[PDB]
Design a protein around this ligand. Structure first.
Ligand code: KWE
Length: 223
């Protein structure tokens, strides 16, 4: 019962994620450097992906920037959960680039942020999302009309709706017996906002730690 428009929107998102990912990824100062290098790569990958999401380029440049400024850490955390290895309790950012809890801590993050990231990753895992579902959830995250500094929130909201609708229809076919899978996925967007909040506290704490974000991350995350 997916419409052709919905099937095509999903295929575009799944293909763009694959393409963007292929393009982008084909003492304690080293660990912080390495970790921020992954972030700068991902920041680019997300910009590249968002440009492929239908409707995104219909917004004004300032709104495109404002949506990406808020979404980027949340999408990074989605992509982190997607790469969670439950067997050894780690995140496989890249073939071999694996991070455990202590590796996050040695990069500069506190336990108050680390543990919720792993709790979120386990919650995500229990949902058993597929490529279509991740990609739809990322599109829905991007078109959040409530982000700071959005000039056309109505337009954003309107661009979100077909993605929400497609997710609703897709999930109703994937698991006709589990009506509640769809709202539990939307609830992961709630958790991501809190995670984003804690992230901003972690960035703040770098200052009276010993550390400075590199320029490309300072732009998006230092306020
Ligand atoms: O906040 C970050 C994140 C994001 C993040 C993501 C996941 C968990 C925790 C944090 C960084 N790096 C990882 C990016 C991974 C991007 C990515 C995803 C998926 C696949 C490949 C690649 C990072 O350097 N900083 C700055 C920072 C701020 C405060 C204290 C220290 C450092």
């Amino acid at each position: 019962q997916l419409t052709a428009a919905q099937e095509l929107m999903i295929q575009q998102l799944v293909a763009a994620q694959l393409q963007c990912n292929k393009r982008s990824f084909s003492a304690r100062q080293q660990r912080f450097a390495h970790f921020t290098e992954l972030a700068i790569i991902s920041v680019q990958e997300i910009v590249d992906f968002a440009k492929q999401v239908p409707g995104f380029l219909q917004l004004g440049r300032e709104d495109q920037i404002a949506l990406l400024k808020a979404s980027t850490i949340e999408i990074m955390l989605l992509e982190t959960a997607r790469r969670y290895n439950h067997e050894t309790e780690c995140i496989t950012f890249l073939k071999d680039f694996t991070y455990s809890k202590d590796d996050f801590h040695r990069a500069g993050l506190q336990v108050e942020f680390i543990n919720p990231i792993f709790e979120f990753s386990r919650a995500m895992r229990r949902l058993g999302l597929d490529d279509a579902e991740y990609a739809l959830l990322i599109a829905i995250n991007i078109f959040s009309a409530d982000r700071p500094n959005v000039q056309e929130p109505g337009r954003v909201e309107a661009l979100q709706q077909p993605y929400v609708e497609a997710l609703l229809s897709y999930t109703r076919i994937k698991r006709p017996q589990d009506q509640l899978r769809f709202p539990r996925m939307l609830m992961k967007l709630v958790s991501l906002r809190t995670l984003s909040s804690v992230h901003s506290e972690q960035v703040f704490a770098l200052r009276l730690q010993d550390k400075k974000l590199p320029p490309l991350l300072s732009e998006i995350w230092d306020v």
